[PDB]
């Protein structure tokens, strides 16, 4: 019976009752490739993982039979798809799982930067008897008006359009940018489209990031692109870790080029405010890689990722996979 | 020349140049009425106050030359408009100053409750190693999906429509209750309207107040209405704070009947978090009466109040005031 | 029992079994005060009319006490409310009845003017071979792009907001002008508000009227105002008829100052297309006063009028009515 | 550069001054391909067509020096892309121009059916005196309320999206059907997605077609699918013709199984109401294939087409073209 792993899992109680008989779901609870067991590394047909354990070219052959790797999530950047596509390993993922959640959390980070609700709550929990109206503006100094602030968006993916759809009502003027979309969407959703990155950086006040991390955009917003940002433009990042540089963003925050920046995923997981380059950065919000989560987007991505193992444990691989992301498979 | 006394503020550097020639502006900076200078109480004809000092009839009858009270904001509930009009004191206000900002900071409250982006930032400031994806769900246990929830707006004026317009895009099925509103505008915006609280609290996964406190809405959400909300339904209150029994909302939070509640204004300002009726409440966000503020909205709001006294120290009161609020003088 | 007229109706079908118990509905099908019978003049408690009969100060006094008149529809300009207010007669309308069918029809007119769909269907039912792509362009010559026009709504009540909500998605940039609205209704919906009619007519590619015809705007768009309109801007009147000049608009059409005009009402109804001041004007759409009709807009306003004549037959006068439109009695 | 033809046109006015230094544009006026030439047909270089002259396998073989085809439309059904690649020819189209016009004519064909602002204008262009409201309710008997109807649009591509953005404000509830989209698009715009076409026709008060016409779409609407539509649901075809079996749509109207149909293209073009399979159908509005036209989109698509041929006669085989088609190229 085809043992199906749950590599970085401890809770297999949604993938069990639908893989109850086709396979023996058995987690590994790993945090490193050298923390999986020999039983799984020698007999585990499929392995649904999460966004924490990272597999590399030299780890995909550290298995003995790995027909499929389902990524319970919207992004396959921690799996070397080009190695799996030649090691006889298809790599699925659940793209549509949390799109109305990443977009809500992103359009909430933008409002938490513009209106300073999180900083106000935090400065009210530290204790601040803010009573006089001259004493309110000194605790909300910077809370800007939204109507008419051009919103960059580096990439109309599924979760890039889902933010341009609900940020057009707040008054934002959206202008996306990504070179891989066909001439198109810019017209059907009613957003301007800039063709080169310098433009999106030069004419945007709240540059966001919604692009999947491939090998051509690693460290997209480094020190060289930050100097192209408008003077005092927020920077929300809910896409992926190695996308925005860290030392450079900290530098830009300390000086003042960035009037605030609410990262949501960091270059070093798990993030904390006591280690790393952002140790002393001002005007910085960070959530612990929680914009994909809800009570119904987990129950929907785990279910739909176990249904993906079901399809690959009976059907032909990879011609019976609803979401494979390497058709460079052999 | 007439004296125009700003009641609570050490800053008059926006309305001074707009009111330089006509009158002589002179701030008073009074956290209460017992700090008004005798000059600015015996010789001031016009007077603009923000929201902190509250003029009652026993107090509005002490100014002996006052002829207009420009109320900076959408408030005027801390000014006894009946008594004011009975003393020849026309009260106006600036209603359109911060609408696109109260609505934007009310939507952010609704999203900070549904996705918990300010309880996660806290848990990261308190220090929490959120490493394993089993711990992500334990630190964010409660974050919900928005598409489908029914947002119920008690009050559909300006700040109520401005939230229905921008919450219809997140999938929030909007629903409102407004008795004083001449029917036929739930048709334009496209939102179902209900006709009684017992019929709005009953179907609303996130009730948000947007009414103006008058002599008939005090403690609208009291101990008797919270027993009509759903079994767990967020409550946002970015509108004047004498609308929720704080001795009955904290009794519902510490019990689980309300799954969190972001209050923007309270009954007692300032709002020292450790002091008050809800000192020990769980799942509670509070900003300090700061949805109205913006570098641009706190300037349009003051220039347009200077311009209002420029019209009252020159025109016929109250037939010259652009938007007076007590034409019962 | 009290008699409840139906001054111009000939159905009294939906209104019959709502007040049959406590009133005897009876229709008259009149077109003037020259058709009503003697006893149903002075004592007839209530009457409910449509937009076809015009009652005047010199007519309502032929009714001693119409304890109520109910104006099925949304406009109460047929009856002198200032006259009824002095003869103990309270006027009522049904405002919320067809607020969105009027907006859908007004958007349909604005799109018929831009895309020329009903000028192309009419040029096909008239016979035209449109084979070559040159003739496609010479027959639909005038159709314009919509994204980036400045639709200007003269009047921002219910039917104005309902169009500003619907036309903000087509790319229009709404710009209204309303002198009676309080400050702020332009900040909630996000539509730039201009304050003087010249300032709305200068910057507008469509000037669609949505104001109720009161005493102070009869013939609002006359020759003088049309001379202020932008060179070649459409004009969609879907409001009361006597609001826009006939002769002046026909002049502006035949001349070129107006690139089309879809009028849903006219100065003199029933509007025939061969007798009138618009006898030979080019580029007109017209509809026979039908933007309020549906299979549901009727059952919602007729029932609502039948309910208004109950609320006004068991309860006291206008302090027990719902949509009273002249509180000016005493 | 060699002669670039303009097969389907008599006017090369904006294509030329952009191509004046590269090649010498000429035209052919071919209403059919056997009407082009014996010398251009031999050795031009390439071409740029419109949507009337169809080029088939046996006909593309007739050209002897064809490098590139450049449609000036949005679709390329009238060219055997699958055969043109095997022949040595690259095919290209201007994909995103008049996306804002097809989706403004489709939201007008949809309101022209729910409000009948083009049948009311017809019936009033024939002399239907309508003063009594009991007669207005007759001339417009059939107009319906929109808020609630479930507009179900086949093919959520580039205009299928631009229509679901415009018709989410009228109250429509949009649901699409598309089997070639990588799932996750129904959640960015908030439109419920159905998976089988029967599941789109069983719940749609107004079905609208927005799909390509490749090979598995011919007569998507048969006598076998119309039997699956709601009892009297409109049908708006503003896509390529050959998706609606006219012989079946001419029955579905003469019985009431379809309460209206706003076709914009047709099986055989040109179109006229006196020769065809639907010569006598009631409730049938049809425009002559001008849902794509404007004064700006018909200048944008025929400049982008003259730029995509400059890039193709200066660049390379389909590695320099921007919007190339036919991965069947060698
Ligand atoms: N906060 C979270 O934890 C969370 C949750 C869900 C998704 N995500 C991330 O969001 C990312 C985007 O999600 P998605 O649904 O849009 O994936 P997607 O494949 O559907 O869309 C990504 C699009 O980004 C554009 N793009 C690609 N490379 C680019 C580049 N170098 N520069 C600019 N644009 C580029 C492309 O147009 C791509 O289509 C995912 O990779 C995923 O990792 C994060
Ligand atoms: N967070 C802040 O500091 C802030 C900023 C701006 C406004 N506000 C408050 O928000 C309130 C609303 O602002 P606004 O611009 O909408 O004023 P508004 O008068 O235009 O809107 C009030 C609407 O609620 C209706 N209403 C009255 N009593 C009601 C009741 N008992 N139940 C339900 N509805 C009732 C009112 O008739 C009206 O429809 C203002 O009183 C203002 O004090 C607060
Ligand atoms: N096509 C139809 O048959 C049809 C259907 C419904 C309504 N209508 C007409 O549409 C009119 C408007 O409908 P409504 O429900 O919005 O009425 P409404 O009273 O609800 O709103 C009308 C708004 O226009 C304002 N206004 C008044 N005079 C003005 C002027 N001189 N210039 C600019 N604005 C002015 C009014 O103050 C108000 O703000 C109604 O009077 C009604 O007669 C026509
Ligand atoms: N009225 C006009 O003259 C006019 C103007 C512009 C475009 N069009 C036509 O409209 C069509 C759509 O335009 P577009 O820009 O969206 O093309 P597109 O390729 O961008 O979008 C087409 C979408 O429909 C999908 N589809 C394919 N077959 C399908 C099927 N059997 N059922 C359901 N969906 C299917 C396609 O995969 C795609 O998702 C074009 O083919 C074009 O020919 C017509």
DSSP C283-303: SEEE-SS-SS--SSHHHHHHH
- Identify the residue among C149, C171, C190, C192 best suited for mutation to test binding to A, counting A beta carbons within 10 A and taking the highest: C190
Cα B75 to ligand 2 centre (Å): 8
Cα angle value A106/A108/A109 (rounded, 5°): 65
Which of A103, A194, A210 is the pocket-test mutation for ligand 1 (most atoms within 8 Å of CB)?
Answer: A210
User: Which residues of chain A make contact with B234, given a CB cutoff of 8 A?
Assistant: none
Residue burial C31-60, b: 16+ Cβ < 10 Å; e: rest: eebeebeeebeeebbbbbbbbbbebeeebb
Which position among A51, A71, A109, A240 bears the catalytic label?
A: A240
Tell whether C148 is within 8 A of chain A (Cβ): no
CA distance B44 to B89: 12
Q: For chain A, after which residues does the C atom lie more than 2.5 Å from the next written residue's N, i.e. where is it broken? A: none
CA distance D221 to D201: 10
Asked whether the CA dihedral A13, A19, A24, A29 is positive or negative, the reply is: negative
Q: Is A54 exposed, middle or buried (0-12, 13-18, 19+ CB in 10 A)?
A: middle
CA distance A315 to C57: 84
Could you tell me if A153 and A183 are in contact, meaning their C-beta atoms sit under 8 angstroms apart? no
Could you tell me if D261 and D282 are in contact, meaning their C-beta atoms sit under 8 angstroms apart? no
Q: Residue D269 catalytic?
A: yes
A290/B170 Cβ within 8 A: no
CA distance C232 to C236: 13
Minimal-distance CA residue of chain D relative to B172: D190
CA distance D213 to D235: 17
C103/B158 Cβ within 8 A: no
Cα angle value C304/C310/C315 (rounded, 5°): 130
Residue burial D79-118, b: 16+ Cβ < 10 Å; e: rest: bbbebbbeeebbbbbbbbbbbbbbbbbbbbbbbbbbbbbb
Which position among B71, B193, B240, B259 bears the catalytic label?
A: B240
* Cβ-defined contacts of D202-205 (< 8 Å, 24+): D202/D228, D202/D230, D203/D150, D203/D152, D203/D175, D203/D230, D204/D150, D204/D151, D204/D152, D204/D175, D204/D229, D204/D230, D204/D233, D205/D149, D205/D150, D205/D151, D205/D152, D205/D230, D205/D233, D205/D234
Helix (H) or strand (E) holding A175: strand A173-176
The chains found to touch C (3+ Cβ pairs under 8 angstroms) are A, B, D
Q: Is D316 exposed, middle or buried (0-12, 13-18, 19+ CB in 10 A)?
A: exposed
The conformational region for residue D286 under phi > 0 = left, psi -120 to 50 = alpha, else beta, is beta
Cβ within 8 Å of residue D230, ≥6 positions away: D201, D202, D203, D204, D205
Q: Rounded to the nearest 5°, which phi and psi values hold at C16?
A: -75, -60
Ordered alpha helix ranges (H), D230-296: 246-254
Which of D77, D182, D239 is the pocket-test mutation for ligand 4 (most atoms within 8 Å of CB)?
Answer: D239
Q: Is A96 exposed, middle or buried (0-12, 13-18, 19+ CB in 10 A)?
A: buried
Tell whether D22 is within 8 A of chain A (Cβ): no
Cα B177 to ligand 2 centre (Å): 12
CA–centroid distance for B295 within its chain: 18
Counting ligands in written order, the one closest to the CA of D262 is 4
Cα C189 to ligand 4 centre (Å): 34
Tell whether B148 is within 8 A of chain D (Cβ): no
Q: What three-state secondary structure class fits A195?
A: coil
List the residue whose alpha carbon is closest to atom 20 of ligand 3. C157
Asked if residue C222 belongs to a known ligand binding site, the reply is no
D323/A158 Cβ within 8 A: no
Could you tell me if B168 and A319 are in contact, meaning their C-beta atoms sit under 8 angstroms apart? no
Q: How many CB atoms lie within 10 A of CB C195?
A: 10
Sheet order of strands, A25-27 included? A25-27, A4-6, A46-47, A68-71, A90-93
User: Which residues of chain A make contact with D106, given a CB cutoff of 8 A?
Assistant: none
Pairing between β-strand A4-6 and β-strand A150-153 as defined by DSSP bridges: unpaired
DSSP string, C145-208: --TT---EEE--SHHHHHHHHHSTTTT---EEE-SSSPTTHHHHHT-EEESSHHHHHHS-SBEE
Candidates D169, D171, D190; nearest CB to B147: D190
Asked if residue C271 belongs to a known ligand binding site, the reply is no
Sheet order of strands, C24-27 included? C24-27, C3-6, C46-49, C68-71, C91-93
Q: Which of A207, A236, A206 is nearest to A144 (CA)?
A: A206
Could you tell me if A3 and A65 are in contact, meaning their C-beta atoms sit under 8 angstroms apart? no
User: Which residues of chain B make contact with D190, given a CB cutoff of 8 A?
Assistant: 147, 169, 171
Could you tell me if B178 and B160 are in contact, meaning their C-beta atoms sit under 8 angstroms apart? yes
Catalytic residue numbers of C? Answer: 240, 269, 289
| Diameter of chain A measured on Cα atoms | 71
Whole-angstrom distance between the N-terminal and C-terminal Cα of chain C?
Answer: 28
> Over the Cα atoms of chain A, what is R_g?
22
List the residue whose alpha carbon is closest to atom 34 of ligand 4. D155
Helix (H) or strand (E) holding B176: strand B173-177
* Cβ-defined contacts of A223-227 (< 8 Å, 24+): A223/A247, A223/A248, A223/A251, A225/A197, A225/A201, A226/A251, A226/A252, A226/A257, A226/A258, A227/A257
Could you tell me if D148 and B187 are in contact, meaning their C-beta atoms sit under 8 angstroms apart? no
Q: How far is C186 from chain A (nearest CA, A)?
A: 13
Which position among D240, D259, D266, D302 bears the catalytic label?
A: D240
Asked if residue D314 belongs to a known ligand binding site, the reply is no
CA distance D231 to A38: 62
Distances, alpha carbon C143 to alpha carbons C115, D52, D291, in Å: 5, 21, 10
Asked if residue A108 belongs to a known ligand binding site, the reply is no
Cβ within 8 Å of residue A284, ≥6 positions away: A253, A260, A261, A262, A263, A278
Give the relative orientation of helices D159-166 and D99-109 as an angle to the nearest 10 degrees: 50
Q: Which of B136, B141, B139, B131 is nearest to A30 (CA)?
A: B131
List the residue whose alpha carbon is closest to atom 8 of ligand 1. A239
Cα B238 to ligand 2 centre (Å): 10
List the residue whose alpha carbon is closest to atom 28 of ligand 2. B211
Residue A270 preceded by cis peptide, ω within 30: yes
CA distance D17 to B61: 81
Cα D218 to ligand 4 centre (Å): 13
Give the relative orientation of helices D99-109 and C99-115 as an angle to the nearest 10 degrees: 130
Cα D211 to ligand 4 centre (Å): 3
Asked if residue D193 belongs to a known ligand binding site, the reply is no
Tell whether C184 is within 8 A of chain A (Cβ): no
C117/D296 Cβ within 8 A: no
User: Which residues of chain D make contact with C31, given a CB cutoff of 8 A?
Assistant: 131
In the annotated binding site of B, the residues are: 74, 154-159, 178, 211-217, 238-240, 264, 289-292
Q: Which of A309, A303, A261, A265 is nearest to A281 (CA)?
A: A261
The length of chain D in residues reads 330
Q: Is C330 exposed, middle or buried (0-12, 13-18, 19+ CB in 10 A)?
A: exposed
CA distance B287 to B105: 10
Residue burial D120-143, b: 16+ Cβ < 10 Å; e: rest: bbebbbeebebebbeebbebbebb
Q: How many CB atoms lie within 10 A of CB B26?
A: 16
Q: Which of C95, C106, B168, B190 is nearest to D148 (CA)?
A: B190
């Amino acid at each position: 019976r085809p043992l199906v792993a749950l590599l970085d899992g401890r809770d297999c109680t949604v993938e069990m009752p639908i893989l109850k008989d086709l396979a023996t779901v058995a987690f590994c609870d790993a945090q490193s490739t050298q923390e999986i067991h020999e039983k799984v590394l020698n007999e585990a047909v499929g392995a649904m993982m999460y966004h924490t354990i990272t597999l590399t070219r030299e780890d995909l052959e550290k298995f003995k039979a790995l027909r499929v790797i389902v990524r319970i999530g919207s992004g396959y950047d921690n799996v070397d798809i080009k190695a799996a596509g030649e090691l006889g390993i298809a790599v699925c993922n659940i793209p549509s799982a949390a799109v109305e959640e990443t977009a809500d959390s992103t359009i909430c980070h933008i409002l938490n930067l513009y209106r300073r609700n999180t900083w106000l709550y935090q400065a009210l929990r530290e204790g601040t008897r803010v009573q006089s109206v001259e004493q309110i503006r000194e605790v909300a100094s910077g809370a800007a008006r939204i109507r008419g602030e051009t919103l960059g968006l580096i990439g109309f993916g599924r979760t890039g359009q889902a933010v341009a759809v609900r940020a057009k009502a707040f008054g934002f003027s959206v202008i996306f940018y990504d070179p891989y979309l066909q001439d198109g969407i810019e017209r059907s959703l009613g957003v301007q489209r800039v063709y080169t990155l310098q433009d999106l950086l030069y004419q945007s006040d709240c540059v966001s990031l919604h692009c999947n991390l491939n090998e051509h955009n690693h460290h997209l917003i480094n020190d060289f692109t930050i100097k192209q940002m408008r003077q005092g433009a927020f920077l929300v990042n809910a896409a992926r870790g190695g996308l925005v540089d860290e030392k450079a963003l900290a530098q830009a925050l300390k000086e003042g080029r960035i009037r605030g920046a609410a990262l949501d995923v960091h270059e070093s997981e798990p993030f904390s405010f006591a280690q790393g380059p952002l140790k002393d950065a001002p005007n910085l919000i960070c959530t612990p890689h929680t914009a994909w989560y809800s009570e119904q987007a987990s129950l929907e991505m785990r279910e739909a990722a176990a249904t993906e193992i079901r399809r690959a444990i009976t059907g032909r691989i990879p011609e019976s996979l609803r979401n494979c992301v390497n058709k460079e498979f052999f």
